[PDB]
Structure 1
Amino acid sequence: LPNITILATGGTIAGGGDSATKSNYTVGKVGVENLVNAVPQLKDIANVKGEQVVNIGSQDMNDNVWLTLAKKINTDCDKTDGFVITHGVDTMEETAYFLDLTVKCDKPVVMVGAMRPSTSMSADGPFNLYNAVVTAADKASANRGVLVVMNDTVLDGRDVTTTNTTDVATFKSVNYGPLGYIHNGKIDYQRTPARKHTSDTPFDVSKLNELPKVGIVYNYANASDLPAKALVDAGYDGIVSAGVGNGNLYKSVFDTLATAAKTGTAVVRSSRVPTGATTQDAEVDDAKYGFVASGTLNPQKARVLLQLALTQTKDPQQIQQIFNQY
């Protein structure tokens, strides 16, 4: 049986409330050992070893946890046959993509969470964790990049997103679909991400102490330019626009971002719209402003790629190419 390492970071999977029945809960007070022991059947599928890396709600996820995780997986790759990472729902799609772009271990790296706390009736965490271990133990899971496993489904860390605030079935790859479905501890893989990941990216965080500063600004009717100005005034290295429609910007926000780009701020147009690509050759002449189009990357995922692009270049043309390859 394979050796699988659980790197725990907190999340609702490690959350608890005083009633099985009421919706209230807190995260940060349930250790990895407790999660493992709630899933006795993991003995049938792997030699599990748990480590508590941090214990936080993923609403508080940050750069330094990202760097710690990537360096730890790259470092320990040779000590184990696979990794499972327990994590909150809220920012799972961001951490999964960061790791997709920075892990050099091509052994399976699987993230898992739960929508219901560990204390609740019909808690989803136990079976999700089981299925994440299944996935991490499956030799066929290697070289697919970093994965999220939730609700009996294996998802690639680039396209995966949380689609509903409360539903146990929330995680979906909303543009290109899942990689495989898990039934009875077996996976029929029918897909693999073509975008370059892991050891095929140039991004190397092994010596990085920090990541370039990238912020996100939202567009809507009568949108204030104040948030965009505040990132510019603080000297942000990059800004991602959560645009309206096909990545469009309220006029105010456009002006501030156009001026920013001319001073060397990287500006990436994404979209608040939950599916579909932010394309070139629509209403914004990106070449003219030095903007980059995000493709199918949503604002939070565009931030991830932008920060990593900014560790290699500040040239908008080269940042567009990165957005076309990763």
Structure 2
Amino acid sequence: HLPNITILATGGTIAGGGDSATKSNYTVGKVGVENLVNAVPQLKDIANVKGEQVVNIGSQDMNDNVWLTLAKKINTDCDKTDGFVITHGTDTMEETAYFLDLTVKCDKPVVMVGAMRPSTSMSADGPFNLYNAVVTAADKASANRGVLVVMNDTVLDGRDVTMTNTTDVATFKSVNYGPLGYIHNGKIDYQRTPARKHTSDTPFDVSKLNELPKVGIVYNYANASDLPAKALVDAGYDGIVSAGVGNGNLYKSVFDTLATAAKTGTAVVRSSRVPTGATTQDAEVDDAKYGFVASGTLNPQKARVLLQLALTQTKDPQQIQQIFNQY
């Protein structure tokens, strides 16, 4: 009758609690996986669920080590289950989802979910999000779509999905290309699938890696200090992502530091602090002249994911641009 679904838990508000149902204060990742699952008894109606705790952190402390652990656990356990759900904080779910989207080689459903309200709160969103994530992970139509995020009755691809609001339960949106499908009464009408290459159609293989190249992010604004970019350069960072103003534009002092870094081997990706649309070529910056790479619709944090992985294969800026055009 029912699919075997593995829940890999990482913490987040979905496993987090406070002293009151009406007070906003909470602490993240106190609740273990077994307690989350038992708190939604209806999951037994749609899946045989096995829970495993990988870590128990707030996703604001998410890191490369947890990413390597998840990618390897999924790639190892692919043939032992029918699909995966990862419980995770909201704050960096959009980064973990895109990392997994590029490094998981299982094309069974892999679904991430979180909660914007603590499990102890009035009208807690976590129970029904988990229910719907398992509905998604259990649906054979979810296979081959890449890694997914299921939040607020919506299935979102891992590349485009991002947090649009600090607090709203409806915060996760695919702000450039839209969602893949909507969940109603336990059924999904998929109308889209991401054309960017994911999972088994990428060359990225972290099976034998215990660390990732070092990539930092710098912000642009009026009168922006070069000290952030200089500090990453002085530490020998492999790459730097610019959170540019407008269409990936650089403050004078930041342009100058990043131009000199790119000349000496630092991979430099222009992204934007602006929440939708592409950082394009052919605007005000001659990328080929400086050795810069344009991020396209990848926001800074998503550009960092792809750049880190691109640096596992190449330091050539032409080849990194080709990777930013395909993944």
Range into which the TM-score falls when normalised by the shorter chain: over 0.9
Does the residue aligned with 1:182 lie in a helix, a strand or coil? strand
Cα distance in 1, alignment partners of residues 224 and 202 from structure 2: 36
Following superposition, the deviation at residue 34 of structure 1 comes to 1.1
Where structure 1 has 5 or more consecutive residues not aligned to the other structure, the ranges are none
Q: How many residues align?
A: 326
Does the residue aligned with 1:49 lie in a helix, a strand or coil? strand
Q: 1:104-160: CA deviations, max 9, x gaps?
A: 000000000000000100000000000000000000000000000000000000000
Q: 1:164-193: CA deviations, max 9, x gaps?
A: 000000000000000000000000000000
Cα distance in 2, alignment partners of residues 293 and 251 from structure 1: 18
Does the residue aligned with 2:7 lie in a helix, a strand or coil? strand
Map 1:118-267 onto structure 2 (within 5 A): 118-267=119-268
Where structure 2 has 5 or more consecutive residues not aligned to the other structure, the ranges are none
Q: 1:275-314: CA deviations, max 9, x gaps?
A: 0000000000000000000000000000000000000000
Cα distance in 1, alignment partners of residues 42 and 279 from structure 2: 44
Q: TM-score, normalised by structure 1?
A: 1.00
Cα distance in 2, alignment partners of residues 224 and 16 from structure 1: 39
Following superposition, the deviation at residue 42 of structure 1 comes to 0.6
Does the residue aligned with 2:150 lie in a helix, a strand or coil? strand
Does the residue aligned with 2:207 lie in a helix, a strand or coil? coil
Moved over 4 A (4+): none
Cα distance in 2, alignment partners of residues 258 and 182 from structure 1: 47
Partner residue in 2 for 1:82: 83
Does the residue aligned with 2:55 lie in a helix, a strand or coil? strand
Cα distance in 2, alignment partners of residues 218 and 24 from structure 1: 29
Cα distance in 1, alignment partners of residues 205 and 43 from structure 2: 33
Following superposition, the deviation at residue 28 of structure 1 comes to 2.4
Q: 1:70-118: CA deviations, max 9, x gaps?
A: 0000000010000000000000000000000000000000000000000
Cα distance in 2, alignment partners of residues 10 and 163 from structure 1: 21
Cα distance in 1, alignment partners of residues 29 and 72 from structure 2: 23
Following superposition, the deviation at residue 37 of structure 1 comes to 1.1
Cα distance in 1, alignment partners of residues 29 and 50 from structure 2: 20
Cα distance in 1, alignment partners of residues 169 and 216 from structure 2: 29
Following superposition, the deviation at residue 212 of structure 1 comes to 0.1
Q: TM-score, normalised by structure 2?
A: 0.99
Does the residue aligned with 1:16 lie in a helix, a strand or coil? coil
Following superposition, the deviation at residue 38 of structure 1 comes to 1.2
Does the residue aligned with 2:25 lie in a helix, a strand or coil? coil
Cα distance in 2, alignment partners of residues 50 and 249 from structure 1: 46
Give aligned-pair identity as a percent: 99
Following superposition, the deviation at residue 260 of structure 1 comes to 0.1
Partner residue in 1 for 2:70: 69
